[PDB]
């Protein structure tokens, strides 16, 4: 009954790959590459899929950084967000980005903090803080069964 989501913390030389997105209406929000788990996939693969679909970069997950369980008061919806850190290992500017993505770009911590009011949720900042705090957990905490 909570919605399972995934998000990627992608840091390269003290900048983070984030998206500016319009989730509803017209307002631009800042967020990690992120989205809902879909049937038929593992959580780690959902994370890589979201990075590719939202940014046009391919992702190599390395660690779990945290799992966040919260309720968005504005939409009454409870989420369980599995957040991973990893590398980006390819980029192709012609890859189509999901509708609703304005642009994907690299932001420094100062820029992210100054944009706090337009963060999609409080988790945008929290996920980065936890990553910066050295929170790194093995991917193999998760065991997926594909149904073979
Ligand atoms: Cl919990
Ligand atoms: Na395993």
């Amino acid at each position: 009954k909570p919605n399972v989501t995934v998000a990627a913390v992608i840091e390269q030389d003290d900048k983070y790959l984030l998206v500016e997105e319009i989730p509803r209406g017209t307002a631009i929000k800042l967020n990690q590459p992120a989205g809902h788990l879909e049937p038929g996939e593992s959580i780690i693969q959902a994370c890589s899929r979201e990075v590719l679909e939202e940014t046009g970069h391919s992702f190599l997950p390395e660690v779990l950084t945290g799992i966040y369980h919260w309720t968005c008061a504005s939409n009454g919806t409870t989420y369980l967000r599995f957040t991973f850190s990893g590398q980006v290992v390819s980029f192709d500017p012609d890859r189509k980005l999901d509708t609703g993505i304005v642009r994907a770009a690299w932001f420094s911590i100062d820029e992210i903090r100054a944009k706090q009011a337009m963060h999609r949720t409080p988790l945008v900042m929290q996920c980065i803080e936890d990553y910066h705090a050295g929170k790194r957990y093995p991917l193999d905490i998760l065991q997926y069964y594909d149904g073979s």
Side-chain angles (χ1 to χ4, degrees), residues 64-68 81-84 127 130 135 137:
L64 181 73
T65 57
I67 303 171
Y68 304 87
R81 173 189 254 217
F82 287 76
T83 305
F84 299 89
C127 293
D130 289 344
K135 297 308 185 162
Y137 306 102

Side-chain angles (χ1 to χ4, degrees), residues 110-144:
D110 282 13
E111 293 164 338
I112 295 164
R113 294 181 184 139
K115 275 185 160 61
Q116 211 131 180
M118 64 180 275
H119 289 187
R120 173 111 180 251
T121 70
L123 305 194
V124 179
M125 191 76 253
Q126 190 59 237
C127 293
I128 290 165
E129 294 174 333
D130 289 344
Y131 169 77
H132 192 91
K135 297 308 185 162
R136 313 275 186 278
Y137 306 102
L139 297 170
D140 78 345
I141 285 170
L142 276 165
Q143 180 64 63
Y144 179 58

Side-chain angles (χ1 to χ4, degrees), residues 11-28:
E11 184 256 312
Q12 191 174 324
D13 308 327
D14 312 300
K15 302 194 183 62
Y16 297 86
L17 188 57
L18 299 175
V19 295
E20 297 179 332
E21 64 191 16
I22 302 176
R24 67 193 44 83
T26 51
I28 300 173

Side-chain angles (χ1 to χ4, degrees), residues 95-106:
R95 291 174 196 157
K96 223 62 77 197
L97 308 191
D98 284 352
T99 305
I101 301 301
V102 177
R103 61 188 75 84
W106 295 88

